[PDB]
Amino acid sequence: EASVRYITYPAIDRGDHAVHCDKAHPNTCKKKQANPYRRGCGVLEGCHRETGPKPT
Numbered sequence: 001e002a003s004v005r006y007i008t009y010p011a012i013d014r015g016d017h018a019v020h021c022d023k024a025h026p027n028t029c030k031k032k033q034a035n036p037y038r039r040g041c042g043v044l045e046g047c048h049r050e051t052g053p054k055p056t
Contacts, residue, residue, distance in 0.1 A: 013019075021029030041047040 018031060019029060
């Protein structure tokens with residue numbers, strides 16, 4: 001028999017290992033990416049980040 005079936009849920013265009021880059025839109029193509037929203041820390045107080053409240 002060797003029966004086999006696969007199913008993939010819908011997605012915009014998120015890859016994993018690698019994706020083909022468009023010759024017309026190669027600047028959109030990225031090997032790796034993160035969330036589209038960006039934010040920088042400009043408080044100048046010190047700005048510190050921790051893994052969690054109680055990583056210990």
